Amino acid sequence: LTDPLKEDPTVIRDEAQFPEPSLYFKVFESEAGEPEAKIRADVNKLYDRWIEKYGRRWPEDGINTEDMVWLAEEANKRKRAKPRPRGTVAAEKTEYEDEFMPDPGPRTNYEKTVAGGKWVTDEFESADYEAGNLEKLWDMYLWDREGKPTMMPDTPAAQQEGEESEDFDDFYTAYRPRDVDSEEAREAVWATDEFESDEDNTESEWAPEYVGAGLGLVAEDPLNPQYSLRHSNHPLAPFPGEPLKWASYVYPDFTTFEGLSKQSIPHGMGVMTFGTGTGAGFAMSQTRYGDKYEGEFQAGYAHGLGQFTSEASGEVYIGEFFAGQRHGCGMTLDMKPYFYLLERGVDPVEAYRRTAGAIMKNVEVRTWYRGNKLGDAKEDEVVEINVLKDELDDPFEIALRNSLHDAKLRKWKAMSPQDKAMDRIVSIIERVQRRNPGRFGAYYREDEKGRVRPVLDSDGADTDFDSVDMIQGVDTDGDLGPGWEGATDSEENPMDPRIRELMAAEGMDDKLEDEGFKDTVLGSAIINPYTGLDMKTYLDGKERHQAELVSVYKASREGRKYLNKVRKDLSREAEDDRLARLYEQAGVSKEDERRVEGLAARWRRLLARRPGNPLAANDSDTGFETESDMMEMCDIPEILGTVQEARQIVERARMWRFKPYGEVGLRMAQDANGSPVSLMQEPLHYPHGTKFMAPGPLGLCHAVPDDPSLRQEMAKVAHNYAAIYRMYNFDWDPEPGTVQYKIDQRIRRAQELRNNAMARYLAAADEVLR
Amino acid sequence: YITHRIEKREQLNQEQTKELNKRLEKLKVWLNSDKGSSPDKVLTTAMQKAVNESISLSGIMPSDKIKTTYGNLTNAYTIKTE
Amino acid sequence: GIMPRKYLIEKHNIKVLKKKLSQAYSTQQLTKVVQEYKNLIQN
Amino acid sequence: LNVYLQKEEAFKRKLRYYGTMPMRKLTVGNQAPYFKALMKRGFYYYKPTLRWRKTLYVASLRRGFRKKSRKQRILVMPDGENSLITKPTHSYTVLGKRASRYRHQIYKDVLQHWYYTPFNRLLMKFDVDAFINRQPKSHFLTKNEERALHIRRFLLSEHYDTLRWYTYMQHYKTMKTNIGGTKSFANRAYNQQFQGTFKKIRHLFAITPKQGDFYTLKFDQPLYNDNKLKDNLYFHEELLT
Amino acid sequence: GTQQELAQMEAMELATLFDMSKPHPLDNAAPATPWKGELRPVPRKIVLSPYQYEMINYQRMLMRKNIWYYRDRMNVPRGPCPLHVVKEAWVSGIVDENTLFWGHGLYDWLPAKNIKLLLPMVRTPEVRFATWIKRTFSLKPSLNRIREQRKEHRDPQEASLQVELMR
Amino acid sequence: LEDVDAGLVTDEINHEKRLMTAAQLRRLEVEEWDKQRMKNFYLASFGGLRWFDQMEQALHNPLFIESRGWTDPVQNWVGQNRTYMDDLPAGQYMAGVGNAAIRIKEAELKRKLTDVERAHVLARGGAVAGGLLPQQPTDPATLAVAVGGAFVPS
Amino acid sequence: LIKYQAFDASTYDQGVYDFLTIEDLNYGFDRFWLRRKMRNHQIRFRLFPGPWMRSLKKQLASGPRVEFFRILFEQFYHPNFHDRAIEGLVLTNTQATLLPTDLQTKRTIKPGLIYTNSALRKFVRNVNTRLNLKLLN
Amino acid sequence: VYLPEGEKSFDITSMTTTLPFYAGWDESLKKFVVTNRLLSRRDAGLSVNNNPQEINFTNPPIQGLNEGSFLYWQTEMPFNSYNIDQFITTNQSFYAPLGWRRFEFRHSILKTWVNKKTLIISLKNLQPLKSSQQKQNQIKTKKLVARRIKKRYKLLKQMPNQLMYSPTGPLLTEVLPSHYISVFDQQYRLPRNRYLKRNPLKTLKKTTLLALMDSSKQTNGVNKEFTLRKRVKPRRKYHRKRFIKKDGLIFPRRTKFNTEEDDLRWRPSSRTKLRQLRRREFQQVL
Amino acid sequence: AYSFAQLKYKDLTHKERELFHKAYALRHFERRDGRPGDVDAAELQAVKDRLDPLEADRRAYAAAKAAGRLDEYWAA
Ligand SMILES: O=P(O)(O)O[C@H]1[C@H](OP(=O)(O)O)[C@@H](OP(=O)(O)O)[C@H](OP(=O)(O)O)[C@@H](OP(=O)(O)O)[C@H]1OP(=O)(O)O
């Protein structure tokens, strides 16, 4: 077969017009929040329509009267829920004539328009049609005979008290009978303009994605995974808009940064030296004057892989960073004695010989979580301990749980999407009720006299919900958490009981005052006139209180006598019988259940925080709020690999350190007396017999100064340069026994296998189609 | 503790009784002119839209809009318990 | 209008340590570990 | 075996940290939500949203509002029911606003296409020919050769990844299946395209091989060797002894 | 029968084909023809599409204000280099196509010939003529003299960078 | 082994479950947030206390919204990213094993195939290979097919 | 864009762009289209009074319907617009040595780690369930 | 760890020192030499030894910040501290946001799944409560104390004129990157645009009762439920010219309501017989 | 007003905190009763040495080497 990788490049000939019809006439789903694209979309449709009639993407005559009708109704359709018409009128036209508009290719508007329909007649104002649409949507009467609103206030808006006038097309749409959705409300009041009659909500506006390091992602194009970073601010995102710049910043506190930057923020790779203060997200107490961090930066944070070096203290850390703190695997060395001997006039070789062994013995490998070292709170043994705890249960519970695990999967495999949504809603409701179950049936009662009264508890509380945790939060178990100036490093030093009770009483009277203010401010408005639901209870979330109160009042003797006077002028049993039917239908008597319960409890349970793995990826019902304060600790090979890659990252990042003419280079490169020095970084001048450093033919003409350490350094630099070179230049005909040869062999094998698979698919298609 | 336990509770009970009386009068306003739940009542708009969003994303093909009632919730709970 | 607010990080660290020791079913080590941590704060 | 599988699950939950993740718990000393917020907003990402078009230009109310009330239209010379709502028909005329916007878009498209016609770009063609004939003749590549070079680069990156210490990990298979073998994106194969706006060249050029049989837009250039390579290419001849 | 087994085996092979840790029998295999050192044939006729012309124009627009940097043998960045400074350094024989350069549109340091449009900018006809003169009459005799004078340049292992300077 | 072969894999089911759960949770939270903002706005406007206005401003904190994750797409909740797989062109070039064959046969027959014919052809093609061929992005053999279909014959 | 200085005159490395992109300012038809008001014909009378000439001019199949698509075809031509055109389970040795016995595989499972891990988890669950049921009987 | 490492050297890339060279006087060899030994970064910029006596620089490195100093170098610092940003409401709220989490859907849950006088208690027949209830009992008292501390109604009643009392959560951090202010660059709509600015009805007059009776009669006694949500569209009057009719009287035009015979539906009857437009400051702009 | 030291060193006493606050923040010209020379340099340098002993030791060794009195340095 022909070699795909050895085609003769004698004649190169491409045929592609720059305004490419493949790339130009196309609408992307990536362009969703952009309004102008909508117009383009319609235009594109028109093009296709013309191609369907003339085949030239250009219309004879021009845009006709029926093109707008087609593009309005027939072109694109939107999802509705359900119609339910009727065939008989329920109103009378005996009132002032021309009150209701009449209602009896005539198929539709487009069919009539293409059959010679002028559509030129104009009549009536828009407000009448919008009011009629709202009235039919409500299925009520919103205006009386005189024309004054019946469901909204008709008096002029009081400028005092903060109220302002509101049009009907807004009030009758922001306040609706809950069987009308936002889309139908917008469609009823003729909201058509794309640019001015639409706004983006605070919680629904488009924002760039967050990908972090961007390692684990679904690749839309498998060959190039960088294509999936186009919607983020990742340093390697394609075409940011402004080129990444080699920033060399000196801050007023003498903190210096040198490396890649996006906009004006450090971004990509670089080296940062700390002066007074801090930077790169580090804590104020971590750094000193002269410490440095080399490695990856992201959004001004030391995020990724790097190395932190402190010349004053000697600590050296190599490894992973998240945000501005150590998070992941890391390796720690303490080279303090080496620096101590170096600063006291000892040559480096002698100091290394003296202090190599002690430093090598004290090398530490660790796993860090949010800047804290793990391994002291038995983080390593958590999983095994939890497995043993799960194994310590009674056999019946374990068997039932294991059967339920398979039953859930088998049930979910065959459910409909609507059934899945309902199931997830039920699960969410159950999870919520596991913390705050409503006091249904215990909100209102009747006293001895028969008067309805609220049902309080052993305290001054009507429901378990408190509005003070909204500003302070709640832990996983139920405790609140830190507050303003909470002090009490450990709460084993509690507050005095007298102060506690006094403050509790003061909080109770404050709650009473708050309730009084809320009532006197919001209780006058009416939300639901059928049940007397005011705005205060509606906005406090106590609608079920009113729902129970209505039934309690109507069932009371006083309520019954009032109803008589004005007239003068699931259940527990259902669940029980369903459970009994389920028990009977399976052939399991209650005696068997009692026997099994006795066997489990008296014979097994008497013989001798939810179950599961605390560190689990898939958890069915999660809530995305429970937080793990630990991670699987790195093993030695993983730490070694992390250090090996971090050293590569540091070496690659240390290439932005001495920009030729930059502020840091001009102001921080000094001799012994502190005066500036003329660094040999001229692009054309190589003085004092250093022309061997020229990376060209000129360098070969001159000789090296004959220093073994310099020769080793040059050899290492040459090795790095060759390693960089090999990644962009290949051989046309590789020799057998080399890596590139096996790569080419595998590529050819892949092509052959794909061709065979396609041939088999074609054979199957031919068999099916004939 | 006694001052917090008894007096404040009585004051809160009295205020709740006054508000209950006002709410009862508001209800009586409609009850006078009435001159006369079902499983067909629709849910709150939040729960009516979350189901639509989950159906839209989860399904292989987008589906039409629905207005969920309490009967569907009852059916789902019954199925899970069964 | 100066309303003081304190940075409570040691309290949160102690609470997280208690939670981690609770999840490992090793509460008997609590008074052994937490105390040591407090000493680490002192010096 | 159960302990091993649970450790694998815990390791996968640990690996979750290297991609998109929700941060829904604000705690003292945790800087992750601040980093997420600064990454979401803090840099400007170009996108033609409503906020951008309102920023550009709205209108000039010299004579007041330029848009007026809508006028319903009715057919004079001859519906699926749905008579609940009467739909607006003010736009069925050709002299309306929507037709004006459509004609504006059509005119823009036609004139943009006519702007790049070959006979209006002769001097550019001559100058580009003169400029591009300066490079050596062996630097020109076919599209298939460029794709082969890209594939070779990323396969060689994977091969060099296969030599790291990560292979000795207990859970190396999970890491390779989930992450990809390296803990940094910078140690993999990627194109050198970090200038210009993405949303502006979407309809002009191609940026990924899957878009079609086109030359991708990038600022780097893989090449074939034009001679028998000397191993000590960057080595000084004095060092080789 | 056998067809289905072969298809399943081929699918299994496809599953693990690009797993570079797994050895493969097609590695280091005997080619259909004996191996001889070949080179890619030099193209003769090139026909650019308008797409390529416009892409080149756009790239030239992006890089018309760039300032370049390069690295020496000691791995030190060297000087702020506008286009004419780069041309002078190329003519003087200080840099060549293998030098590591950096500009605005890149993320890392790459060889000069691997940057998209850097060699066409430098290589004006005058630059070519001057670099040919410099290579032929100044650097080559000096290299011969330094090779003859000092024995530290091993005859069997001699670099050929001066020979290819003209390109 | 039978349960695994039947498709009852825990991960592929739990992923969808958590995606739907997050989808419902986002809406259920953003509606209560709106109600709590409206209550405070009405208290501040119709009343005369600045404390409720400051409470509404605190509820309008961008950091709180970002931490809640309401702006982020629901996919980022579970761990993956939103992919527009339909934007990429669907042609013979880099088509996949089945799609390329279907398009070639349609071109040979000069007429587009229907849904039932396409389903039957794809089913038989998958069955003849034992079903081991990649069909989803997470399959390990997608990259090999993509590389194999990356060269256009001259 | 009369509110801003909508032109780019930056020199050297210095240059910033936000919501006024490089392509709009410097490149191609975006820059050319963004300045379309320079080529709009205006009515002017140098000597005669404005209102009288305007009234006379106003005193004197429509334009937008047909002429818009006619003039574009006549003047600005482009072909794109105006041309008609078994061992199916692969277990590592660490996984293999953890199985209690030597078991036989009768099914070919799709390649991948997730399926193998799911099979192992299901086997563990089944073994535990069987052990508990046997003990409780 | 008992793994082979002799074939390689653990370094994929060699670590090369990157330091520029310069020529100077060694004063130890007493020779003019080219080297790369630069002054340490722990002493660069702090002092110079030009004169035989060392000179220490005072002003150059700043070691403190005040209001004016912060205002002069506001956009040139690498970090921002809470000690100065605590006097701005938005900055303080960004430093210490609300801790609201684990929402309870009290507005939407409503109905549940399936369906009290004081009792004299003798002390001798009571048993100690388990440890799982003491914490729950203490939680309510802790919440009451938190409400006393953070929502003292006395202070917030007179806060604007002579005090400062704002709702914030616990302090999460002390320093932030100096470019966090950019998060506030894109603003949100004012609350008046999002919500309605006037209350619904407060009284039920004759026409309202008639309409409610008709609506209830239509639905076989199953009354409707009303919800109050945010605005669905912007005000049309701000960007559009609309006709004004009579004194606000509206006569809707529509088709008749569909189900006749005996009971029809009747609309209730109460009696039963030119400058330049100013420019508003938009909030959703770049 | 802060002095970059109350946020860095967590063991500062009230007197040392006030000394740093007056020395590097709210200078004598920024205080209503401030006068030149209010902050003593010797006490501030002593506090700085107490907060970081090793840097002071290194500088002392450097000074002794410059003065050629290393015996007195090592005999301390
Ligand atoms: O429940 P009972 O058996 O009826 O006993 C109670 C009990 O007293 P004894 O424990 O001595 O029986 C009460 O005291 P405590 O146990 O709660 O401490 C006491 O009330 P005091 O606490 O006020 O003493 C009360 O008597 P009384 O109701 O008269 O106060 C008395 O009930 P009897 O009086 O019916 O025996």
Swiss-Prot record, chain C:
It comes from the Eukaryota. This is Uncharacterized membrane protein ycf78. Essential for cell growth. May be involved in binding chloroplast DNA to either the chloroplast envelope or the thylakoid membrane. The lineage of its organism: Eukaryota, Viridiplantae, Chlorophyta, core chlorophytes, Chlorophyceae. Belongs to the ycf78 family. The gene is ycf78. It is found in: Plastid, Chloroplast membrane. The chain holds residues 1948 to 1990 of 1995 of the full protein.
